C-alpha cells in the first residue's frame, strides 16, 4: 500500500495528463476510489506531481461525472495537513472557485467543504480565495435550500468578511444584506441561524453595509430570534442590533423590536441588559414614534428598574438613562413618562447617579435627565426631597472654576463647558417652582448666574440669563440680582444674535424695577 | 410694557433637548458545524487541525 500504490501513482499521472479525454475520466474515477482507503490517500497526498494533475483536470474538464469524483478527490485530502498543503502549492483555489459556478449540487458540496478547510487551516489561503473572486460566487449560493451546505456557506463568508474592508464591500455589492436577512426570517437550523447572525455581526461594523442591513429589513428580522433558546444566537442577533442601532433611527415598524428589548431589560444575564439598554437608547433617538411605543408597552417601568438593578455599572447605567431622557421629551407622552419615573420610585437612584463614583458622560446624561423631569410640576418637590439642587449646584461651581483655570479641553470626553451649560439648564427649569427658587437662592448662587453672563458660549447665556429671569419673579430676589451689578451685561445681552438670551434679559431688567 | 405681556413673551420661548446616539461597533467578543450529506465514508481530520485554533 505504502509500496504498491507509490508506483501506481506516477501511473495514475500520466493517465491524468492523456490527451483522449476518455481515458482522464477512467483514471479520476480510480484516483476517487484510492482515495476512499487511508493508506492511499496518504500516497496521492505526498505527491505534488499527483495533486497538480487532479487540480488541472478539475477546472479543464466538461464532464460532470468526472467533476465529482476530482472535487471528491480534493474533499478527502483536505482532511490532512499535507493534504491541504499540497491543494494550496498546486493552484487548487481558483480551481475550486470556478467549481462554485456548477449547477451539480455534489461537486458544490464538495468544493465548499474543502475551501472551508483551507479557510480555516491553511495560511495565506484567504487572499487567495478573495483575489480569485471567491465572494462574489459565495453570496450568489446563498439562494440554495440545503440547510447544512448554506451553514458552511455562510461560515466561508464570516472567515473572509472579518476585519477585511473590501471583502466586507464586495458582499454587499453582490446582495449579500438582503440574501442574509432572507436567511433568519426563513430557517429554523440553529447552526445557520447562528453562523449567519456572525456574518451579519460583521458587517454591522461597516459604514455602508450598515445601513444596507437596516434597509433589507433586518431590525425586524434579527428581532425574531431573541426569544431562541441557543443564547448563543440571541447574544449575536443583539450585538448585530447594537452595532445597527445607531442607523435605525428612520425606521418604521418597530413596535415588536422596541417591545421584546424592554421584556429583555428583565434577564439575569449581563450581556442581555447591556445591549437591550444600548438598542433602546439609539432607537429613542429622534424618533418620536419609537418613544411613543417604549412608553406604552412598560418602557420606564422597566429602565427604572434596570437602573436599580445596575448599581455602578455604569455599562448599563449610561444608555439606560441617555434611553430615560429621550423618552422624557418632544413627544406626545412626555408629560406620561415625566410623572412614571416619579411613580415607579425612580427619583432617588436618577438623584443618587449625580454623585460619585459615576464618571462624567453619566453625570452629563443624568443632568439632561433632571432638565426634562422638571418639566412636570408633581416632580418639583421629590426631586427638592432627594437633594437634587445642591448637587446641581456643586456640579456647577466646581466646573465653572476649571473653565476659570482653563482660561490663562475634556475630561473623560466630556468638556466642563458642558456641565456648566447642563446643571444651569436644569436649575432654570426646578426654579419655576417658589419653594426651589428659596433653595437656589439659599445656595449664594446668584453671583455664580451673573458672572455666566459674561461667558463666549451663547448656549450658557441663555440658561444663566434664564435662571435669572425665574428668580427675578420674586422682588427680593430681584433686587440681590440687581445688588450684584448684573444691569451692565443683561443690558449688553440685549443685543444679541439669539432671541432666546435677549428675551430672558429683558425680563429681568424689567424684573428689577417694575 | 405690563406685567402680564412680559411674562407672555418668555412663557412662548421653549428650551430644547439634544438626543445623541451612541457608537457601538463590536465585531468580535464551541461545537463544530456538521458535515454535508455525500457519498463518501467518514474521515477524520488531523490532531494538529482539530486541537489548533483557525488562522487569523
Redesign the interface.
Known sequence: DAELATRAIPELTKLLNDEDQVVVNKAAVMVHQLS?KEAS?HAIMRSPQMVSAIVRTMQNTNDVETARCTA?TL??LS???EGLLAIFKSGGIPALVKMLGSPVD?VL??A??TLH?L?????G??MAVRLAGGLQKMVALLNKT?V??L??TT?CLQ?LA??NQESKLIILASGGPQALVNIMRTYTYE?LLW?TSRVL??L??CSSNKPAIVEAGGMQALGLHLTDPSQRLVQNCL?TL??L??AA?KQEGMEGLLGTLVQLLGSDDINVVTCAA?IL??L???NYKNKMMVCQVGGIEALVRTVLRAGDREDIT??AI?AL??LT??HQEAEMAQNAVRLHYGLPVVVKLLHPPSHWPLIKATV?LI??LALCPANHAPLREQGAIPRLVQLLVRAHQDTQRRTSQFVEGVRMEEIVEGCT?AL??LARDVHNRIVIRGLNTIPLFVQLLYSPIENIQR?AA?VL?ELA?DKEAAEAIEAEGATAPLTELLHSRN??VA??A??VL??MS? | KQAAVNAAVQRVQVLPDADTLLHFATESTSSSLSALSLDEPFIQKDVELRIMPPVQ
Open positions: 476512499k490517500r471528491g474533499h478527502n482532511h490532512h495537513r455534489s458540496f464538495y465548499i467543504t478547510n479557510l480555516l487551516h491553511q495560511e489561503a484567504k440545503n447544512k451546505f451553514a458552511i461560515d472567515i472579518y476585519g447552526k453562523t455581526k460583521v454591522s461594523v450585538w447594537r452595532n442601532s445607531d433611527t444600548g437608547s439609539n429613542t433617538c429622534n449610561e444608555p441617555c431622557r429621550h421629551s418632544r439632561g432638565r426634562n439648564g432654570h427649569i440658561v434664564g429671569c419673579q432671541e432666546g428675551t430672558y429683558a425680563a424689567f424684573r417694575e
